[PDB]
């Protein structure tokens, strides 16, 4: 989520061990680190362009992605810097030899490299436990905005 400020905390925010020698007058102020999570996921430019901090960013932070890669549909974005997706799926009761609709919500961290609104299909990746619930991290938006601007005023 973030938005604005960057130094909005009691502790000074910084990328660990990414020194900038004040003696060397430079143009970029802060040297910034980044990587690619791998598995073929492009690291969005907003991660390399940005100045947000986030130690739980999969491109600019100290996490790794390894394990289940899942996709789900965004259903809540009220948490700051983390979301809840719903993964729906059908479930085969035998005996009746058909299925019933089930689901589970899955809480997932979300780097301010992405701007997510509710309804977006998103691909997330497996994480070291990041928080009490969260064990996943948004890792690409396979969506956009769900055609909102083609809902406008009048002729």
């Amino acid at each position: 989520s973030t938005e604005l400020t960057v130094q909005s905390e009691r502790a000074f925010q910084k990328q660990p061990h990414i020194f900038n020698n004040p003696k060397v007058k430079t143009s970029k102020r802060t040297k910034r680190w980044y990587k690619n999570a791998g598995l073929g996921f492009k690291t969005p430019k907003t991660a390399i362009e940005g100045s947000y901090i986030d130690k739980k960013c999969p491109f600019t932070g100290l996490v790794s992605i390894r394990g289940k890669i899942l996709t789900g549909t965004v259903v809540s974005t009220k948490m700051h810097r983390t979301i809840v997706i719903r993964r729906a799926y059908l479930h085969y009761i035998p005996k009746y030899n058909r299925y019933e609709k089930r689901h589970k919500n899955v809480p997932v961290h979300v780097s301010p490299a992405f701007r997510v609104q509710v309804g977006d299909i998103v691909t997330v990746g497996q994480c070291r436990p990041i928080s009490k619930t969260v064990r996943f991290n948004v890792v690409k938006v396979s969506a956009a905005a769900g055609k909102a601007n083609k809902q406008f005023a009048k002729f």
């Binding site: 055609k147 083609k150 809902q151 009048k154 002729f155």
Partner: protein, 150 residues
Amino acid sequence: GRMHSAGKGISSSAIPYSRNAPAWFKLSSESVIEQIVKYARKGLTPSQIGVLLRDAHGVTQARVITGNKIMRILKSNGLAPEIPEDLYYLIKKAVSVRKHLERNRKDKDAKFRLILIESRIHRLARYYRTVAVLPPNWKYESATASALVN
């Protein structure tokens, strides 16, 4: 079929196999697309127009002599209403029925039709709402329905 009744009435138009021509129909898209617009411009609903073209003139199927459905002529020329006209007319009726209900609290039958009429509105509203033609969160309320029509 028959949504809010137990009618079983199969009445309808029977459109011809002939998806073009009428061959004995001279004139031209030119002439008739313009024809649509001037009426749209008067203030008529595409339906009223499709009719006032079916009788006075030779416009059998407005989509045929002009490869377009009348409501698309209208939008394309920016003549298209706030809300679709079926929805427009449902709402317009609900208002007048309501107006009767307010002056006639004793008329339970009218209360019953209002529900019906409003229920259709609400389903329809949802359709258009689902398919972009209305904004998400477009809503119908009595309190503000009267303004919508007139």
